[PDB]
Amino acid sequence: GPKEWQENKSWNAHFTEHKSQGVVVLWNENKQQGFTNNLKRANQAFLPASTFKIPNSLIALDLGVVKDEHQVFKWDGQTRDIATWNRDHNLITAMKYSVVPVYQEFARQIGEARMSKMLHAFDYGNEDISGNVDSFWLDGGIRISATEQISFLRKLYHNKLHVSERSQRIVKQAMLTEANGDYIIRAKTGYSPKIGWWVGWVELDDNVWFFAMNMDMPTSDGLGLRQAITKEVLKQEKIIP
Amino acid sequence: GPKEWQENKSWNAHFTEHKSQGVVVLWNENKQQGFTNNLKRANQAFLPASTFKIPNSLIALDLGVVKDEHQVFKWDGQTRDIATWNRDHNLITAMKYSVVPVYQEFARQIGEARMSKMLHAFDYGNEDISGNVDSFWLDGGIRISATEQISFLRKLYHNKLHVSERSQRIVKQAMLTEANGDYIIRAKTGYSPKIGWWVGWVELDDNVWFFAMNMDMPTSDGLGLRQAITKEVLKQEKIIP
Ligand SMILES: *C(=O)N1C[C@H](NOS(=O)(=O)O)CC[C@H]1C(N)=O
Ligand SMILES: *C(=O)N1C[C@H](NOS(=O)(=O)O)CC[C@H]1C(N)=O
Ligand SMILES: [Cl-]
């Protein structure tokens, strides 16, 4: 019989081009088949870092901590290193600019008990929120693999997570990254010390390709390699032009 | 003091450059003010043509004629002149490829009584469905002006139409045309005998600009001028780069 999961090591060339190492995992929804350059690393669990703003957003919306995608979270007046964080935001722009202080406030309002219960309900990674309620996804005990990211994203795509359909549609809107006549990408980046992520999916006319990539990220320089390397894989596989 | 609507006739140069005539209407949501090159034509009511697939989609979803954006409507097997129509479609691809026969099926299932009631609820144009329920927006009596399109789109953007929030969110998803780090465009084209349309909005980080344009279209050549002329106005006004 055909293989649910196949390894394509030729994608390693896209990492080697940049003196980097990592994994891209692709899932072809119509075929129900997955593809990766590194089967072992595809299943190793890492801190989710800013990719956690996907479940954090869902939980905040479903609990009413965030009323809708237009509600304004005012800047607290603390001048931070990332200039785009030093302004008022809504859910859309907080996702777009990956505004940590806004999501820390969401997490504090959610609280430890509800956050833990909701990650259990989501089957999210190791479901472990050990650490600070407002930083465990950056320096605490939570861990998720690339294949687990795809599983979670597939549930989100199909409105199957244990939150309202409305919360799922709002977050999928907030994940919008790029759209043209050839494809739509909904995705979220992340970076914790050691590891950069890009997770999401590519919508085509007649199929959807889910993706989850992580790579060794010693420096914030080359954060753009997350999208660049993934797009080289997508181009090689003729998913995007 | 300032007016709700201001005329900017310098935009006429974008029509003149293409030996064409028409109107662009913009609405700045933050400032609650509108701008147009021709206030008279901005209020002239025309057949909506394929821009009707916005309200038609909303009504079909809210009545359950269309269950969700993934439900497939199979090709009826009749080979029509637009090749992309000769295939199966869902709501997303039917709006992208402007598949009239799919929307005619929606309209027949909606039926005349519910169609008329819903367009009245929407305050949509002249609300006149006289003719056939599956062609009145192509060759019947319904008429809508560019400013009426703006009013309708503003209600849709704010989830204020008399249909479920869910139906409104799905249609706004289906309207997605272009997205990048600078802007998102949700919009729909149309073409009836001698008139081309483009209506929708441009989402920015801290504002939304609604737009409705129409132009004289004596031949099918120059349909791309609908977006091209609109984008020249958007660029002149520094809404997009
Ligand atoms: C999340 O991983 N973070 C917040 C912010 N996002 O940048 S990224 O999404 O482009 O990775 C900066 C990196 C990281 C953090 N340092 O908290
Ligand atoms: C809608 O106005 N129509 C359907 C189709 N779409 O073309 S457009 O959306 O690019 O204007 C062809 C034109 C028109 C029609 N002939 O019914
Ligand atoms: Cl969207």
Numbering used by the authors:
A (entry chain B), B (entry chain A): 21 to 261
Question: Can you provide the manuscript's text about this entry?
Answer:
Nacubactam is distinguished from avibactam by an extended C2 substituent bearing a 1-aminoethoxy group. These are characterised by complementary electrostatic interactions between the DBO sulfate group and Arg250 (OXA-48 numbering) and positioning of their C2 tail groups close to the β5–β6 loop. Lys73 is fully decarbamylated in all DBO-bound structures except the OXA-405 : avibactam (both chains), OXA-163 : avibactam (only in chain A) and 16 hour OXA-163 : nacubactam (both chains) complexes, where Lys73 is modelled as partially carbamylated, in dual-occupancy with a free lysine side-chain that is associated with either a water molecule or chloride ion. The desulfated hydroxylamine group can form hydrogen bond networks with the active sites of OXA-163 and OXA-405 via a water molecule, observed in a similar position to an equivalent water in structures of the uncomplexed enzymes, that is in dual occupancy with the intact carbamoyl-enzyme sulfate group.
The OXA-48 carbapenemase is widely disseminated in Enterobacterales, necessitating new treatments for producer strains.
